[PDB]
Amino acid sequence: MYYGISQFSEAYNKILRNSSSHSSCQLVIFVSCLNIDALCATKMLSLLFKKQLVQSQIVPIFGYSELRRHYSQLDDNINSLLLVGFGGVIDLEAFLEIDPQEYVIDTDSGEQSFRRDIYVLDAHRPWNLDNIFGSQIIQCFDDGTVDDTLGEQKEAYYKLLELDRKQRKKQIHEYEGVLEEYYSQGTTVVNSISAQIYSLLSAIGETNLSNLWLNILGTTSLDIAYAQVYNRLYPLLQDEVKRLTPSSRNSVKTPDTLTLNIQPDYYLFLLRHSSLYDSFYYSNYVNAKLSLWNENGKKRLHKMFARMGIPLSTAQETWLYMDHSIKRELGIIFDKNLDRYGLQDIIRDGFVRTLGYRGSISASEFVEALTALLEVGNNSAQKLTNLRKRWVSNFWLSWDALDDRKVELLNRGIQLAQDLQRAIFNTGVAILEKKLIKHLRIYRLCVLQDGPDLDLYRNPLTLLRLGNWLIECCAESEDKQLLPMVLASIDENTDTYLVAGLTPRYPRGLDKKPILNNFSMAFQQITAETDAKVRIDNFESSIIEIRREDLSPFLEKLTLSGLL
Amino acid sequence: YSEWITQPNVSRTIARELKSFLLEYTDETGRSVYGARIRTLGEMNSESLEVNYRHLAESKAILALFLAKCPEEMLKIFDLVAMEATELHYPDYARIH
Numbered sequence: 001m002y003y004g005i006s007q008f009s010e011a012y013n014k015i016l017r018n019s020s021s022h023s024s025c026q027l028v029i030f031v032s033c034l035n036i037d038a039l040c041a042t043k044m045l046s047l048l049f050k051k052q053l054v055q056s057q058i059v060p061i062f063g064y065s066e067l068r069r070h071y072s073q074l075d076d077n078i079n080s081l082l083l084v085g086f087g088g089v090i091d092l093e094a095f096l097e098i099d100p101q102e103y104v105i106d107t108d109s110g111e112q113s114f115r116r117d118i119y120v121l122d123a124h125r126p127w128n129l130d131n132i133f134g135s136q137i138i139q140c141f142d143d144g145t146v147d148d149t150l151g152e153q154k155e156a157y158y159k160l161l162e163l164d165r166k167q168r169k170k171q172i173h174e175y176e177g178v179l180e181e182y183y184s185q186g187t188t189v190v191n192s193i194s195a196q197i198y199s200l201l202s203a204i205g206e207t208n209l210s211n212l213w214l215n216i217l218g219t220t221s222l223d224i225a226y227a228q229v230y231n232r233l234y235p236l237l238q239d240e241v242k243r244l245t246p247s248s249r250n251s252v253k254t255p256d257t258l259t260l261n262i263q264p265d266y267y268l269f270l271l272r273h274s275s276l277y278d279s280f281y282y283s284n285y286v287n288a289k290l291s292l293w294n295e296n297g298k299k300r301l302h303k304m305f306a307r308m309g310i311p312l313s314t315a316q317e318t319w320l321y322m323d324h325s326i327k328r329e330l331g332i333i334f335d336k337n338l339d340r341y342g343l344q345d346i347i348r349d350g351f352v353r354t355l356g357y358r359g360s361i362s363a364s365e366f367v368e369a370l371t372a373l374l375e376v377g378n379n380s381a382q383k384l385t386n387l388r389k390r391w392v393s394n395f396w397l398s399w400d401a402l403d404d405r406k407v408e409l410l411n412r413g414i415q416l417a418q419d420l421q422r423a424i425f426n427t428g429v430a431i432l433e434k435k436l437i438k439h440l441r442i443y444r445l446c447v448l449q450d451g452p453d454l455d456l457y458r459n460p461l462t463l464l465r466l467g468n469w470l471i472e473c474c475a476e477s478e479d480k481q482l483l484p485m486v487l488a489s490i491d492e493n494t495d496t497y498l499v500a501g502l503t504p505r506y507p508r509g510l511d512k513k514p515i516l517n518n519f520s521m522a523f524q525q526i527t528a529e530t531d532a533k534v535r536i537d538n539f540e541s542s543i544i545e546i547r548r549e550d551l552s553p554f555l556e557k558l559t560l561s562g563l564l
Numbered sequence: 565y566s567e568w569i570t571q572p573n574v575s576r577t578i579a580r581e582l583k584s585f586l587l588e589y590t591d592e593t594g595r596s597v598y599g600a601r602i603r604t605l606g607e608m609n610s611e612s613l614e615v616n617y618r619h620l621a622e623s624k625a626i627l628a629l630f631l632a633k634c635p636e637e638m639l640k641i642f643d644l645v646a647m648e649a650t651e652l653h654y655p656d657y658a659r660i661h
Contacts, residue, residue: 299607306606309656313609 001132001146001154002139008196009203011119011139016052018117019080025055026077030067031084032539033060033395034461036370038085040218041121041193043402044211045082048201060395061086062388064095065537071096080117085193086539088122089520091130092138100136112136123191126182129157141200143191153182184563186503186516187542189226194218195233198240209260212240213363214402216260216351217370220363224284224468227505228514237351238262255356264331265350265362267508269421272360273414276322276330277305277315282421284469285508288476289343293429304341308333320359345509355404368421369413373398375462376416380494391459423453424465431470439483442564445555446470447497448489457489458498460543467502475507482506484519484564486555490548496535497551501542517542522563526554569630569637578638581624582645589623598649606654611661613646 003011019026027049031042042058049056061067067086074081083092092098096118103114120131120140131138132146133154140146146154156178163172198215201207216237223230241262251257268279268286280286280301290304291297305315310333314323326333338344354360377397378390401410431437431446438445448454456462467487474480482504488497501519506512519542527534532550546554558564568574586598597619605613620628631638650657 302607302609303603306609306654306657306660309654309659311609311660 001142001150003141004147005142005144005199008141008200011141012200012204014117015080015119016054020052020054022053022055024077025057027054027056027080027082028074028078029056029058029082029084030061030070030086031058031395032086033062033392034374034459035085035539036221036367036374036398037123037193037218038121039370039374039395039398040214040221040402041197042084043399044194044197044201044214044218045084047211047214048204048206051206060392062392063537063539064090066388068096076115079115080119082119082121084121086122086124087120088127088131088140089124089187089541091128091134092118092120093130093135098135098137103137121193121196123189123193123196125188125190126185129153129179129182133157134161141196143196145190150182152178156182184518184521186518187520188514188516189222190229192219192222192229192233195236207240207244209244209258212237212244213260213351213353215240216363217366217402220351221367221371223364225464225503225505226514227508241351253357258353258355261352261354262349263352265348265352265364266334267346267348270365270368270414270417272319272362272365274418275316275318276310276326277301277312278418279319280304282418282425284472285345285476286343287425287428287469288472288474288508289341291473293425293432293473300341304337304343307340308337358407361410365414366410368417369410370398370401371461371465372415372417372420373401373409373413375420375459375465376456377413380496384494384496387458420456420462420465423456424462424469427451427453427457427466428469428473432473437470440559442559443483444474444485446485446487447551450490454489454492458491458494460498460500460538460540463487463489463498463500463543464502467500471502471505472508475505482515484517486519486558488551491545494545495548496545497548498543498545499551518564522558522561525563526557526561530554530557565630565634566637569634569641575641578627578630578641579645581627582642583649585620585624585627586645586649589619599653602650602653605650606657606660609660613650615642615646 015027029042029045032038046056046058059070061070100112100114103116104112105115106113114137116137118138120138122140123143125145127140127146127150131140132150156175160172160175160179163175194215194217198207198211201211219230219233219237241260245260251259267283269283271279274282281292286301287293287297290300292301302312305312310326314326317323334347338346351363352360353362374391374394377394397409398413400406401413427448430451436446436448448457457466467485470487471485474485475482484504485502486499487502488499490497501517501523503515503517505515523536523542523544527536530550530553532546532554534544534546534550534554536544538544569578586602587596589597591597598615601614617628617631620631631642
């Protein structure tokens with residue numbers, strides 16, 4: 001529709017025509033922080049506009065409240081915005097209080113043109129149809145979804161817009177039915193924003209190994225939650241790695257050689273920086289398969305290394321210093337053993353990068369380091385604002401870690417990733433030991449009232465780490481029905497729970513159609529009925545924060561609602 | 565006794581005998597005790613297998629008598645048997661010990 005996958009080039013040419021000059025800064029990029037894919041997309045975008053010498057500004061934004069703040073203080077000189085990683089799922093034209101007759105210029109002719117473009121780079125679905133069809137200013141980059149799927153909804157939208165008698169009543173009732181069946185779909189991410197920008201770079205001819213690595217990184221960040229999308233996009237990344245890889249073979253390792261490979265990248269947590277033992281131990285998938293949160297699962301992991309013939313001391317060596325023969329042989333050892341434990345999906349081919357002699361890093365490890373920097377890198381409303389400012393400031397640590405000139409900062413990210421995952425694991429074993437999960441009929445509920453690490457889980461990404469750890473543990477059990485989950489943690493300073501509504505998912509190795517997050521609109525509907533003072537301004541609208549006293553009324557109304 | 569333990573037909577028979585003991589001796593629950601202990605040994609990466617003498621007095625007691633009367637030879641055989649049993653139960657435990 002607005003800009004299809006075939007015509008991102010026209011949008012980029014328009015950006016240069018409108019908003020490039022030696023004279024003035026004219027382009028503003030709003031990027032949702034606490035989103036790796038949006039970060040990588042903005043990095044690629046900023047390198048493009050660096051090479052093309054477009055004077056531009058990047059603002060990292062936490063949520064919709066900060067969006068409407070910052071948008072309200074943009075000068076008329078700013079005639080293009082790029083909204084990266086948010087804004088598709090909401091009527092931005094209404095939300096930002098746009099009037100096209102307040103933005104129109106040079107209409108002459110049956111024609112219109114405007115003093116500010118607002119381009120939207122978002123992978124979230126369902127699209128708000130006022131962005132896609134209603135607005136003449138909001139300009140969404142589409143993966144193909146609108147043309148592939150939304151023909152009936154397009155028809156219904158335009159006819160209901162035109163349809164201002166019994167036939168008339170039946171028609172407007174019908175198209176209201178279509179649009180209210182399209183809305184009240186659960187939320188879901190269908191693409192990587194970074195691969196979307198990579199398709200733009202492919203259309204311009206700007207592809208190179210830096211931009212390909214950023215595409216790989218932003219795409220790899222989807223792998224935990226949105227494995228089906230990652231499996232859609234992985235073959236195209238293989239094609240581009242082969243296309244850009246240089247032609248020399250049996251190449252001698254040299255200080256200048258950046259080599260980006262497809263090779264075995266196991267589903268283990270930070271293998272090349274953890275010990276081998278810790279890389280099994282702190283992996284979400286390994287914990288799910290082995291039930292590692294208890295002593296019997298720990299015994300099973302020891303049993304595994306014993307049957308592999310690996311001494312436990314060797315397994316606990318830091319991977320650089322771990323025995324070279326074991327590292328050369330590790331693929332064979334895994335092949336010969338991991339089917340016996342059901343861990344055969346540990347085997348995977350993923351993207352590994354090495355730059356001269358300073359050692360290999362996979363896209364898996366790199367996105368873990370970047371998330372760690374986002375999470376922990378550095379009157380109640382004021383304290384909340386200061387907290388959100390800390391998270392905005394963490395964005396630039398992840399940003400700077402994307403540059404090879406600052407690999408010490410990436411190493412900080414690696415260390416913080418290990419310690420974060422340790423905190424996740426300890427809180428997780430607390431939940432599963434003490435059985436904090438309550439099996440309500442429609443969804444599973446978990447509420448963290450007290451304990452250590454509670455001051456971490458006020459960050460949305462760290463809460464989602466614990467959620468994903470728990471959900472991997474649930475998915476790999478045939479005992480449990482695949483119910484949606486609510487996970488909450490109190491902030492004892494603000495006196496508000498942070499609450500996350502989480503999808504289930506099928507076990508990791510199996511293949512079906514994706515299952516959608518309907519906590520987003522369910523939370524909206526309860527928020528619309530209730531007197532409770534809940535906030536819903538986070539970009540990932542299935543995450544909210546709610547005052548402590550309001551939680552039990554809220555969850556009671558949630559479980560009495562039929563929306564889940 | 566030592567001349568008997570080291571006689572190679574006798575030695576081969578003794579090897580099979582202790583191997584059969586470690587395989588087929590059970591608790592009254594039917595579990596092989598030395599199956600469970602070998603499992604635990606590898607989980608601990610231990611060099612030591614705890615064998616209870618009374619379990620050997622309870623089955624193929626001639627081996628228990630030999631073990632008392634001539635331990636230097638008999639433990640030499642029984643160690644090789646224990647290594648074979650755990651290598652059967654944990655392949656490549658030769659790499660660990």
